[PDB]
Symmetry: D2
Subunit: 232 residues, 4 copies
């Protein structure tokens, strides 16, 4: 299958597949069952920001999610990503809706990769354009007239549709390690707007890192965040 590293913002607790019993952020290493989680005071209708970082000396993947005027949620996991991921990857965003639903609106996304053997890649998208040729849009992901990326289906009136799955991948492969590297790092930031008519919105949004040829696995909708074919 694919090889996935993800930071999930998991709005829907699926205790049946190992979620804790609250919305949470999680570090996912080759499984939906997060290796580390933290409770997330999800706020619908408010714009949130997520920052993710890692460097290969610290071997600590971390993420922080916050909204204006609120406490941040943090999560960290000790991991050498070179033992998990291939040396060339694609970076992406994923989101899913299920029976319950939510918008998974990305307003901005930026990413920096460094590889000192200092090789680097940086992109920053604040306005997504109507046909973004440096993104590979998969499933239901589209950009809208407001210049936002809609990971999952929303109606023209701005209402989220159920059972949607969408991903956006930066077009260029990212070099995250190599045999002569002294140190590799990456940082990602996105802002996101989750709105929902539902008391329990579902399912979540991720930033992820995959084999470059990654595509939405069959059976990966809802709780699997468009990342994993099963909940192992």
């Amino acid at each position: 299958a694919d090889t996935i590293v993800a930071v999930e913002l998991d709005s829907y607790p699926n205790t049946d597949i190992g979620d804790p019993n609250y919305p949470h952020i999680g570090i996912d290493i080759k499984s939906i069952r997060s290796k580390s989680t933290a409770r997330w005071n999800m706020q619908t209708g408010k714009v949130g920001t997520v920052h993710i970082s890692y460097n290969s000396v610290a071997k600590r993947l971390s993420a922080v999610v916050s909204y204006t005027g609120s406490s941040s949620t943090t999560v960290s996991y000790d991991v050498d990503l070179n033992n998990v991921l291939p040396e060339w990857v694609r970076v992406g965003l994923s989101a899913t809706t299920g029976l319950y639903k939510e918008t998974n609106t990305i307003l901005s996304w930026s990413f920096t990769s460094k590889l000192k053997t200092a090789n680097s890649l940086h992109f920053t998208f604040n306005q997504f354009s109507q046909n973004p040729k440096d993104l590979i849009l998969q499933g239901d992901a589209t950009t809208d007239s407001d210049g936002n990326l809609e990971l999952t289906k929303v109606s023209s009136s701005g209402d989220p549709q159920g059972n949607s799955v969408g991903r956006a991948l930066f077009y260029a492969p990212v070099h995250i390690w190599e045999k002569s590297a002294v140190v590799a790092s990456f940082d990602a930031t996105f802002t996101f707007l989750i709105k929902s008519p539902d008391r329990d919105p579902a399912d979540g949004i991720t930033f992820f890192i995959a084999n470059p040829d990654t595509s939405i696995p069959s059976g990966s909708g809802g709780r699997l965040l468009g990342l994993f074919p099963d909940a192992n």
Copy 2:
């Protein structure tokens, strides 16, 4: 055909196609016949650096080439690149050898694009890896065991071959304008090592900007720098 904007470092004067009678740098707008040139005191066997910039408010494309301990050469051309190039492009490097020849060794290459509607793309390659998945290598272009990019053919003993043509394009398309942009800019830097057994090395090296689907035109070897199918 393709649409090309290039900064050439033209080592070989081909007065028959409008070159001035000396090595020169040039700004090429949809033609090998540079819209502006400056005389270049080409130094073989020394590492040189080229910096190219443009922003859409100034509407002035410029370049500077220097070596340590030497005078720099500068060239500028007033041009609104949105009247020349499509809004999505690829950026690349090209080089050619002819009957006379030279290495067209790139040691480092970096590029930054900005589009404020602040969207950006930045890459920097200081060590080119043995299979660079974020470059599209065309013609004879390869990376070598020293972690350099060889635009044109060199033997294992490091001797340049004649009648070579090679290009390297950054894999991701670059968004250089759009209908809602307030200002777009880009900057590129490369370092290069031209060595030659010849008293008149040929042919030259370029940084270029093209339609994303660009490929080496038929008939584009030698003086045409792997950019143009003819010398119109």
Copy 3:
């Protein structure tokens, strides 16, 4: 006196000192009497953005001012700033009110300087803190509880006071040229919020570059933008 290069956003036309008869942006080289102006459709109560750039090869200082949903204003002036400014400078923002007045609220400010002999300096302030130790606040300039920089006096109810003058300078000197430079460039961005009770707000806001020891000249209030001791 000081040596000043500025981009003015001049809201108040003072035809008596050479202003054109409308709000305008201007490039000021050692004089309030702009070397180049463009008409500015000033919009009070809307957040605007200014981008300024220059590089030493192009020798073209330019600026663009825009608001969301509106046309941008651009201005350019051909100038070699090394013939104007010393090699070490400070960068700053200035603003003034007169009998008529306006807020000169800066919400964000960023600046990048490059000097390839690639030496660089970059700062970005999105939230100004209550005591910003990397700024030299002069005259009435203060930061407020919203994390904005108030160049000129505003009451706690948010009303602009008249006859105010304030400047904010980045604490560290900036190296903009030197004897061995091949190319020097800089870019600045700020966002600003000008609100006014007045049908003709006054006086304006600038980004400026000065001798490092610059201070508000005596007699520099109002139309002189806290930059110049007179209108020569």
Copy 4:
């Protein structure tokens, strides 16, 4: 006294003050007695590179030192620097010689600080100029005709002098935390050239972070790296 966080490159083992019995790199938190060390295969006469990073979510300060063709040395220490350092700091480099000596030549230094409440500061010095107005040079630190920073005394023939102490601080204070920060990070890189006539060169080189008003403590020469007044 001062408050110091440092990454030391400690060439001289002073087992009497807690050094391990080999050259080593170390993370120093308010004491010369490193909280974490790693053995360093110091190579004199070869240019080395050090990268240091930290972010406040991971709470892990790390460093890596390498030379071309050699193994890197890494060291990490878990620490929340906001519990150690004040919110405003200066960043600097220090080096000392003793009875035994070494050059402490810095060829390049760069630093990036981020504070997302995304405020940032970045500098990069590849060529140090003859009078660097954005550095505060303390003790014997000077820049030389090659455009390098000599932290400790070297003769015009390039021979290191003994019992030297010098530091270079970036002129502007750096904001590393504040009450509303969601995440703060920093990265530093320097390259360095340690040459010595001695079989056991002394004493070492550091990157450090201090209260902004930091100055070379009395009694801080040699093993104390110009950082600490004693070896507690």
